[PDB]
């Protein structure tokens, strides 16, 4: 010991968690400028869009040019995974725009460094969608009562995945969450739930405590496009757990 890429580690990894403390959820306009209209001025140098029929202003993490995992989350994705804190992936659409390019970007890219679970629930204001559900809120974390298997073999879409990492003395698992929101419907529960009632404000308050959080937001030629531009102004304030 040390190798000075040992020792740069040492210190992006501390760079990186003093940012993370003190840093919120992460957004991701994914942009279809084919398809994009005028009213939407974009901007690649400050990260920016307007919105001309509405004055607004959005900032986001990062902006990107028109598979998601592979070419531009896969940063992300990885980012979470070796620092061992559990994180979730929104992906917000207007219309059903990935779920299968993301269990095929999985299979392909950790089966050699994690044993991978799965659970996939369909949730409604609630289906097992891997049927040959219970669920229960804990303070590490929800689990579904749900059918569970590994990657080897108005509702939301609710998947689970635990990371069991292969050379690891470390009992506990890591829990990534990928939700699908793709009904309009659902943009107003998002939005309360951020800042009792409902099944879905339950478990999405629950995923926005104790996990990291990054959305992904479709821009197509939608009718609710200014809606999801909207919607990820509030979400902008998710702070990150601690």
Known sequence: HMTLGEELSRRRRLLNSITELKGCARLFANIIEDEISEKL???????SIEDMKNHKTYKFTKLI??????????????????????????????????????????KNNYFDKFVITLQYVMLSDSQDLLSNIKLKIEESTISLGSTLITLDENGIGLSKFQFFCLQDIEPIPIDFYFIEIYQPSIYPILKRSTGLNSP???????????????????????????????????????????
Request: with cysteine.
């Open 65 to 106: 040019q028109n598979d998601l995992f592979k070419e531009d989350l896969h940063v992300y994705i990885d980012f979470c995974l070796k620092r061992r804190e559990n994180f979730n992936l929104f992906s917000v659409g207007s219309s059903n725009i990935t779920f299968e390019k993301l269990l095929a970007f999985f």
């Open 200 to 242: 879905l404000e339950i478990v999405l308050k629950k995923i926005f405590h104790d996990t990291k959080s990054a959305f992904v937001f479709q821009i197509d030629h939608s009718a609710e496009v200014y809606d999801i531009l909207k919607l990820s102004s509030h979400l902008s304030f998710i702070r990150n757990p601690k």
């Open 41 to 47: 001025i974009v901007n690649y140098s400050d990260e």
